């Protein structure tokens, strides 16, 4: 069946000229609302959540791991390094790298998390260990953001990402202290106010991770604490056929607004 919310999302998509993917889980009842929920989309920097969570998982058996230093050499800097460039020829701890990756979207910090896991396949292996059979990370930064239509690399589906984000932030994929740390990091994101957040009532609390890339790819994944309701998880993925299209965070906001009104 096509619901009223799905029809509105289809109209939004048609007007946008791109391809939109949405998955909502409402923990009030565990019901899901999906739009293209089983289609693959490039994750771009939303994949930073999985990498940071995988390192948090390692920290459950190594109480000092998040204090472990990692060398930042000049050759490690990639194309967006607002935090890591201040540490070149020095070090950052795994906690600092995780915070920089999640809250500033630092691509050098992401590459250090990937390396701590043994490469992109180490992130995919963690995803599988927590029940996500869909996610795949194939490349490091920055090339994981090429977002080429039809390319399977570095993709997931909205449904799979919403389920995993639920398990990570509200469920028991991580130990209690690690889950609290991930939620703290997401709630302190600096990049999210024009994306899902912009479509929701201002009284609600949001933790989110954005992403963007070529093909005008514009993404956001969020855990939401509404007013007077149990938490939600919402994934909004958008990509465009025109390679040099500008990103459209407003489309993500519009999709979130449609979802919120249909609750």
Nearer to ligand R6Z, 75 or 203 (CB): 75
Stretch of residues binding ligand R6Z (CB under 6 A), selected from 90-98, 126-134, 139-147, 155-163: 139-147
- Among the listed residues 31, 91, 143, 205, the single contact to ligand R6Z using CB under 6 A: 143
Phi and psi for 246 in degrees, rounded to 5? Answer: -80, 150
Do residues 196 and 188 make contact, with C-beta atoms less than 8 angstroms apart? no
Stretch of residues binding ligand R6Z (CB under 6 A), selected from 148-156, 177-185, 208-216, 221-229: 208-216
Nearest distance, CB of residue 140 and ligand R6Z, angstroms: 10
- Among the listed residues 247, 252, 253, 254, the single contact to ligand R6Z using CB under 6 A: 247
Choose among 102, 98, 93: nearest CA to 65. Answer: 93
Nearer to ligand R6Z, 33 or 135 (CB): 135
E runs forming strands in the chain: 19-26, 31-35, 41-42, 69-72, 90-93, 155-156, 205-213, 217-225, 232-239
Stretch of residues binding ligand R6Z (CB under 6 A), selected from 4-12, 23-31, 85-93, 209-217: 209-217
Phi and psi for 106 in degrees, rounded to 5? Answer: -65, 120
189 binds ligand R6Z (CB under 6 A): no
> Coil, strand or helix: which one is 98?
helix
Distance between CA atoms of residues 100 and 166, nearest Å: 22
212 binds ligand R6Z (CB under 6 A): yes
The Cβ of residue 178 has, within 10 Å, a number of other Cβ atoms equal to 19
242 binds ligand R6Z (CB under 6 A): no
Question: Is 45 noted as a catalytic residue in this protein?
Answer: yes
Stretch of residues binding ligand R6Z (CB under 6 A), selected from 4-12, 57-65, 92-100, 140-148: 140-148
Do residues 259 and 236 make contact, with C-beta atoms less than 8 angstroms apart? no
Nearer to ligand R6Z, 6 or 212 (CB): 212
Q: Which tokens in the block code for residue 143?
A: 């090339």
Phi and psi for 47 in degrees, rounded to 5? Answer: -65, -15
CA angle 51, 54, 55 (to 5 degrees): 90
Q: Which tokens in the block code for residue 41?
A: 């989309």
211 binds ligand R6Z (CB under 6 A): yes
Nearest distance, CB of residue 33 and ligand R6Z, angstroms: 24
Q: How many residues bind ligand R6Z (CB under 6 A)?
A: 18
Length reported for the chain: 263
239 binds ligand R6Z (CB under 6 A): no
**What residue ranges bind ligand R6Z (CB under 6 A)?**
45, 79-80, 105, 107, 142-143, 145-146, 191, 210-214, 218, 247, 249
């Amino acid at each position: 069946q096509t619901s009223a919310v799905q029809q509105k999302l289809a109209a939004l998509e048609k007007s946008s000229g791109g391809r939109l993917g949405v998955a909502l889980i409402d923990t009030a009842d565990n019901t899901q609302v999906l739009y293209r929920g089983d289609e693959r989309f490039p994750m771009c920097s939303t994949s930073k959540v999985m990498a940071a969570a995988a390192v948090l998982k390692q920290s459950e058996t190594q109480k000092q791991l998040l204090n472990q230093p990692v060398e930042i050499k000049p050759a490690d800097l990639v194309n967006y390094n607002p935090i890591a460039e201040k540490h070149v020829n020095g070090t950052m701890t795994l906690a600092e790298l995780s915070a920089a990756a999640l809250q500033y979207s630092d691509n050098t910090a992401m590459n250090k998390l990937i390396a701590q896991l043994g490469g992109p396949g180490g992130v995919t292996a963690f995803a599988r260990a927590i029940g996500d059979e869909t996610f795949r990370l194939d490349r490091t930064e920055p090339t994981l953001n090429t977002a080429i239509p039809g390319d399977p690399r570095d993709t997931t589906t909205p449904r799979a990402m919403a389920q995993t984000l639920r398990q990570l932030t509200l469920g028991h994929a991580l130990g209690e202290t690690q889950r609290a740390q991930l939620v703290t990091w997401l709630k302190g994101n600096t990049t999210g106010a024009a994306s899902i957040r912009a479509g929701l009532p201002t009284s609600w609390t949001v933790g989110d991770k954005t992403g963007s890339g070529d093909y005008g790819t514009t993404n956001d994944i969020a855990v939401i604490w509404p007013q007077g309701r149990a938490p939600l998880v919402l994934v909004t993925y958008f990509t465009q056929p025109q390679q040099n299209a500008e990103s459209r965070r407003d489309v993500l906001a519009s999709a979130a607004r449609i979802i919120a009104e249909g609750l």
